[PDB]
């Protein structure tokens, strides 16, 4: 009698009705007949396990699952569907009465892509991989217990199909213990986070990217539980110390989303330089707070910190107790940006110069020895040259080419150091003349560019002015 | 109404949205409007050459190209953007239905350094050189014919 | 972790990588390990003088200087390289923070022949002559004041 009820519930669905009508027209009636035979057999295989019948009702009421089943019975792979329903029956039986775990199954099997992936994994004769994976699910769910935040994170992580594929791949390779260790690390991360919406939100965001999850699995595979635990502790501390300020939390979410920054953070948390990362996050907080809501400076900070090499340089410099050098450098950058105002062509040169990591290392070196006014006057001379370029774009293009080179910038800082500032000024306007004399004859501009761009001829030319 | 489609596809990109927000912040309200006027003009210059407007949907939906265009409209070189979009149109109509040649154009104009170099060469009133060079590209493509190894070398060497 | 940055920057150079691989082949692995130990020791002997770390990042990046250092570590002259790096550290520390003088040192030590002559002159236990000569360089640079003609002539003559 239950089979007739299930058949009726399936047939009364309008989408199912339209699909069945289409498949009746196209001559595939025996495919529908085989599918209903499989449904009857699945009901008879469930028997007195009424929770399995309640699962099948939900699974077949969904029209997309029914459409996938029709496509998969058509091509003669109905035995794959029988094997899948047998495995699902075994998984629901072995759980017994864990209603939260059966709720997780009712959720995961309703999602079409998960059902398609499971069908594909049951076709190629890898049934034990699905069995082991459902066992791991039940185990992690029982371990979670009275801690609904962790079960919510687990449900969200499993709903993502890419993470589901990664989990199936790692279970296939018999890395089950690595997966168990990872869920234990998630448990001892959620327990530590407690009720704090920002930290739980950061976990919910970060753990959802496949790259970060793959990196985490690749580190816990080599028995590195302490590394991951201390990294989550450092992130919790960074959120707690951040206070209420959206612009810092945004940078944390961004930088931690970037995979290579997360790799560098793991490498520096392993070697017991944890307090270095703490002080670095403090320095970022100070830079953001002292840089107000000025969007130009904030964008410059985001571009500078998003680049991994500059991030590593900053880590190495806070490592050896020179945090105040980084602070003074960010102060000089903020000062230079404030004098730029809305003159976007000049701010573009700050973006180009500071985006080059070698020039950032040189600037940190030049600020450390307390020559900061040299850098200040050099930025002012760059402004007093760009503002004099006016509307002549080949000059500014030559200047973009010239200042990107690290050794030319070093030589310019050297000539500003020894008190010959005016000569540097006289150089830049002189270049303007060679442009204005050049006009539109690109061969002369090309020759001038080949004479300017190399360091030795540059230092020679600086000596003749 | 394809202009509205272009606007939606352009502002949908998050980096483009960030750039536009920044350019609204620092007090350059009219520069975004001038750029969108140039975009509207470029759309209505294509007319029924739907492949050209598809090429514009490609080019303008790239953060680097769009930022370069904004900065290059800033300091009064607006017309340099109008001229360039004209010449590309001349390159597309004269190119005809050689879809592989339009593929090479899509590849080349996506690279920001190529687009900046072309902006420099159209700025100083050497547009004829860019037009002749696109003609050389078309001719080398037709001469190469259906022989994809040579077209791959051509793509790499011009990239 | 600065030492790791030096190792990565050194091994990024293809020529240095090939030299290391070749010396791995011939059964001289402990010579490469001893050289890296000397590098570590000189770095941690430099301390918080980041200018000295920059000098080591420059001098050791050069492939010929690395080759000469490796060959001098081969035949049992490790202490000679250690003494030379110590003397360079002392000349940078006593040199103060005159950036032009440190530029002269960065120039003169990048030249391979000057480095080989200094190694030969530290080998024979004449350590103080090198330090005295660096003192003479410091004095001549500080006496030149701001007059780049003379500093250019001096760089040329000492090169």
mmCIF file of N, CA and C in Angstrom, chain A residues 289-351:
data_model
loop_
_atom_site.group_PDB
_atom_site.id
_atom_site.type_symbol
_atom_site.label_atom_id
_atom_site.label_comp_id
_atom_site.label_asym_id
_atom_site.label_seq_id
_atom_site.Cartn_x
_atom_site.Cartn_y
_atom_site.Cartn_z
ATOM 1 N N UNK A 289 43.976 52.505 11.150
ATOM 2 C CA UNK A 289 43.335 53.501 12.001
ATOM 3 C C UNK A 289 43.950 54.883 11.810
ATOM 4 N N UNK A 290 45.277 54.961 11.708
ATOM 5 C CA UNK A 290 45.936 56.244 11.506
ATOM 6 C C UNK A 290 45.797 56.736 10.071
ATOM 7 N N UNK A 291 45.377 55.875 9.146
ATOM 8 C CA UNK A 291 45.137 56.288 7.779
ATOM 9 C C UNK A 291 43.711 56.678 7.466
ATOM 10 N N UNK A 292 42.870 56.891 8.474
ATOM 11 C CA UNK A 292 41.486 57.315 8.392
ATOM 12 C C UNK A 292 40.696 56.537 7.362
ATOM 13 N N UNK A 293 39.669 57.190 6.823
ATOM 14 C CA UNK A 293 38.852 56.624 5.762
ATOM 15 C C UNK A 293 39.254 57.140 4.390
ATOM 16 N N UNK A 294 40.410 57.789 4.292
ATOM 17 C CA UNK A 294 40.949 58.303 3.041
ATOM 18 C C UNK A 294 41.065 57.148 2.055
ATOM 19 N N UNK A 295 40.205 57.095 1.035
ATOM 20 C CA UNK A 295 40.135 55.884 0.205
ATOM 21 C C UNK A 295 41.379 55.640 -0.629
ATOM 22 N N UNK A 296 42.103 56.690 -1.019
ATOM 23 C CA UNK A 296 43.329 56.499 -1.789
ATOM 24 C C UNK A 296 44.359 55.737 -0.963
ATOM 25 N N UNK A 297 44.602 56.193 0.269
ATOM 26 C CA UNK A 297 45.563 55.519 1.136
ATOM 27 C C UNK A 297 45.128 54.098 1.451
ATOM 28 N N UNK A 298 43.834 53.890 1.687
ATOM 29 C CA UNK A 298 43.353 52.547 1.977
ATOM 30 C C UNK A 298 43.560 51.621 0.785
ATOM 31 N N UNK A 299 43.280 52.109 -0.427
ATOM 32 C CA UNK A 299 43.508 51.296 -1.617
ATOM 33 C C UNK A 299 44.989 50.988 -1.799
ATOM 34 N N UNK A 300 45.856 51.971 -1.542
ATOM 35 C CA UNK A 300 47.292 51.720 -1.616
ATOM 36 C C UNK A 300 47.717 50.657 -0.611
ATOM 37 N N UNK A 301 47.202 50.738 0.618
ATOM 38 C CA UNK A 301 47.533 49.735 1.625
ATOM 39 C C UNK A 301 47.058 48.355 1.198
ATOM 40 N N UNK A 302 45.872 48.281 0.596
ATOM 41 C CA UNK A 302 45.343 46.990 0.173
ATOM 42 C C UNK A 302 46.166 46.406 -0.971
ATOM 43 N N UNK A 303 46.571 47.244 -1.928
ATOM 44 C CA UNK A 303 47.430 46.771 -3.011
ATOM 45 C C UNK A 303 48.796 46.338 -2.493
ATOM 46 N N UNK A 304 49.358 47.091 -1.545
ATOM 47 C CA UNK A 304 50.683 46.772 -1.021
ATOM 48 C C UNK A 304 50.656 45.461 -0.244
ATOM 49 N N UNK A 305 49.623 45.252 0.575
ATOM 50 C CA UNK A 305 49.583 44.054 1.404
ATOM 51 C C UNK A 305 49.069 42.836 0.646
ATOM 52 N N UNK A 306 48.308 43.032 -0.432
ATOM 53 C CA UNK A 306 47.816 41.885 -1.187
ATOM 54 C C UNK A 306 48.941 41.170 -1.920
ATOM 55 N N UNK A 307 50.012 41.879 -2.244
ATOM 56 C CA UNK A 307 51.139 41.276 -2.943
ATOM 57 C C UNK A 307 51.956 40.445 -1.961
ATOM 58 N N UNK A 308 52.205 39.163 -2.241
ATOM 59 C CA UNK A 308 52.809 38.298 -1.212
ATOM 60 C C UNK A 308 54.239 38.663 -0.852
ATOM 61 N N UNK A 309 55.037 39.123 -1.817
ATOM 62 C CA UNK A 309 56.435 39.431 -1.530
ATOM 63 C C UNK A 309 56.557 40.561 -0.516
ATOM 64 N N UNK A 310 55.759 41.619 -0.680
ATOM 65 C CA UNK A 310 55.779 42.713 0.284
ATOM 66 C C UNK A 310 55.298 42.230 1.642
ATOM 67 N N UNK A 311 54.340 41.302 1.658
ATOM 68 C CA UNK A 311 53.887 40.724 2.918
ATOM 69 C C UNK A 311 55.028 40.001 3.626
ATOM 70 N N UNK A 312 55.812 39.225 2.875
ATOM 71 C CA UNK A 312 56.939 38.517 3.471
ATOM 72 C C UNK A 312 58.006 39.488 3.959
ATOM 73 N N UNK A 313 58.254 40.555 3.196
ATOM 74 C CA UNK A 313 59.220 41.566 3.624
ATOM 75 C C UNK A 313 58.777 42.209 4.932
ATOM 76 N N UNK A 314 57.492 42.548 5.038
ATOM 77 C CA UNK A 314 56.993 43.138 6.275
ATOM 78 C C UNK A 314 57.106 42.161 7.438
ATOM 79 N N UNK A 315 56.824 40.880 7.196
ATOM 80 C CA UNK A 315 56.989 39.886 8.254
ATOM 81 C C UNK A 315 58.438 39.819 8.715
ATOM 82 N N UNK A 316 59.374 39.787 7.765
ATOM 83 C CA UNK A 316 60.787 39.725 8.121
ATOM 84 C C UNK A 316 61.229 40.968 8.876
ATOM 85 N N UNK A 317 60.618 42.119 8.587
ATOM 86 C CA UNK A 317 61.035 43.344 9.258
ATOM 87 C C UNK A 317 60.416 43.498 10.642
ATOM 88 N N UNK A 318 59.200 42.992 10.855
ATOM 89 C CA UNK A 318 58.660 43.000 12.213
ATOM 90 C C UNK A 318 59.291 41.884 13.037
ATOM 91 N N UNK A 319 59.870 40.881 12.371
ATOM 92 C CA UNK A 319 60.505 39.770 13.076
ATOM 93 C C UNK A 319 61.640 40.260 13.967
ATOM 94 N N UNK A 320 62.447 41.193 13.469
ATOM 95 C CA UNK A 320 63.703 41.529 14.129
ATOM 96 C C UNK A 320 63.543 42.793 14.964
ATOM 97 N N UNK A 321 62.310 43.076 15.387
ATOM 98 C CA UNK A 321 61.898 44.122 16.317
ATOM 99 C C UNK A 321 61.785 45.492 15.655
ATOM 100 N N UNK A 322 61.993 45.610 14.348
ATOM 101 C CA UNK A 322 61.834 46.889 13.659
ATOM 102 C C UNK A 322 60.396 47.154 13.233
ATOM 103 N N UNK A 323 59.434 47.096 14.155
ATOM 104 C CA UNK A 323 58.065 47.455 13.802
ATOM 105 C C UNK A 323 57.934 48.954 13.552
ATOM 106 N N UNK A 324 58.676 49.769 14.307
ATOM 107 C CA UNK A 324 58.544 51.210 14.156
ATOM 108 C C UNK A 324 59.043 51.688 12.803
ATOM 109 N N UNK A 325 59.938 50.941 12.155
ATOM 110 C CA UNK A 325 60.353 51.314 10.808
ATOM 111 C C UNK A 325 59.195 51.157 9.834
ATOM 112 N N UNK A 326 58.446 50.059 9.948
ATOM 113 C CA UNK A 326 57.270 49.882 9.102
ATOM 114 C C UNK A 326 56.234 50.960 9.395
ATOM 115 N N UNK A 327 56.056 51.305 10.673
ATOM 116 C CA UNK A 327 55.098 52.358 11.004
ATOM 117 C C UNK A 327 55.503 53.691 10.384
ATOM 118 N N UNK A 328 56.773 54.074 10.530
ATOM 119 C CA UNK A 328 57.233 55.329 9.943
ATOM 120 C C UNK A 328 57.108 55.319 8.425
ATOM 121 N N UNK A 329 57.365 54.176 7.782
ATOM 122 C CA UNK A 329 57.205 54.121 6.330
ATOM 123 C C UNK A 329 55.751 54.315 5.917
ATOM 124 N N UNK A 330 54.816 53.648 6.601
ATOM 125 C CA UNK A 330 53.409 53.887 6.291
ATOM 126 C C UNK A 330 53.016 55.331 6.565
ATOM 127 N N UNK A 331 53.642 55.967 7.554
ATOM 128 C CA UNK A 331 53.359 57.373 7.812
ATOM 129 C C UNK A 331 53.841 58.251 6.662
ATOM 130 N N UNK A 332 55.048 57.987 6.153
ATOM 131 C CA UNK A 332 55.554 58.746 5.010
ATOM 132 C C UNK A 332 54.659 58.551 3.792
ATOM 133 N N UNK A 333 54.194 57.321 3.562
ATOM 134 C CA UNK A 333 53.306 57.080 2.425
ATOM 135 C C UNK A 333 52.002 57.851 2.593
ATOM 136 N N UNK A 334 51.430 57.831 3.800
ATOM 137 C CA UNK A 334 50.202 58.585 4.038
ATOM 138 C C UNK A 334 50.419 60.076 3.810
ATOM 139 N N UNK A 335 51.554 60.605 4.271
ATOM 140 C CA UNK A 335 51.852 62.018 4.063
ATOM 141 C C UNK A 335 51.952 62.345 2.580
ATOM 142 N N UNK A 336 52.648 61.499 1.818
ATOM 143 C CA UNK A 336 52.783 61.739 0.385
ATOM 144 C C UNK A 336 51.434 61.663 -0.320
ATOM 145 N N UNK A 337 50.555 60.770 0.135
ATOM 146 C CA UNK A 337 49.236 60.657 -0.478
ATOM 147 C C UNK A 337 48.388 61.880 -0.152
ATOM 148 N N UNK A 338 48.501 62.399 1.072
ATOM 149 C CA UNK A 338 47.690 63.550 1.455
ATOM 150 C C UNK A 338 48.039 64.787 0.637
ATOM 151 N N UNK A 339 49.309 64.956 0.268
ATOM 152 C CA UNK A 339 49.692 66.075 -0.586
ATOM 153 C C UNK A 339 49.301 65.865 -2.043
ATOM 154 N N UNK A 340 49.029 64.623 -2.449
ATOM 155 C CA UNK A 340 48.600 64.380 -3.815
ATOM 156 C C UNK A 340 47.201 64.883 -4.096
ATOM 157 N N UNK A 341 46.326 64.851 -3.097
ATOM 158 C CA UNK A 341 44.989 65.387 -3.287
ATOM 159 C C UNK A 341 44.199 64.530 -4.250
ATOM 160 N N UNK A 342 43.722 65.155 -5.325
ATOM 161 C CA UNK A 342 42.966 64.472 -6.367
ATOM 162 C C UNK A 342 43.733 64.378 -7.680
ATOM 163 N N UNK A 343 45.034 64.666 -7.665
ATOM 164 C CA UNK A 343 45.861 64.634 -8.868
ATOM 165 C C UNK A 343 46.204 63.178 -9.168
ATOM 166 N N UNK A 344 45.300 62.523 -9.902
ATOM 167 C CA UNK A 344 45.357 61.073 -10.064
ATOM 168 C C UNK A 344 46.585 60.607 -10.838
ATOM 169 N N UNK A 345 47.115 61.433 -11.740
ATOM 170 C CA UNK A 345 48.274 61.010 -12.516
ATOM 171 C C UNK A 345 49.497 60.870 -11.621
ATOM 172 N N UNK A 346 49.578 61.658 -10.549
ATOM 173 C CA UNK A 346 50.695 61.520 -9.620
ATOM 174 C C UNK A 346 50.521 60.296 -8.730
ATOM 175 N N UNK A 347 49.320 60.114 -8.175
ATOM 176 C CA UNK A 347 49.036 58.952 -7.335
ATOM 177 C C UNK A 347 49.259 57.655 -8.100
ATOM 178 N N UNK A 348 49.055 57.669 -9.420
ATOM 179 C CA UNK A 348 49.386 56.481 -10.198
ATOM 180 C C UNK A 348 50.864 56.129 -10.084
ATOM 181 N N UNK A 349 51.738 57.136 -10.017
ATOM 182 C CA UNK A 349 53.159 56.842 -9.860
ATOM 183 C C UNK A 349 53.480 56.283 -8.480
ATOM 184 N N UNK A 350 52.788 56.730 -7.428
ATOM 185 C CA UNK A 350 52.967 56.080 -6.135
ATOM 186 C C UNK A 350 52.529 54.627 -6.194
ATOM 187 N N UNK A 351 51.413 54.350 -6.868
ATOM 188 C CA UNK A 351 50.988 52.960 -7.004
ATOM 189 C C UNK A 351 52.034 52.137 -7.745
#
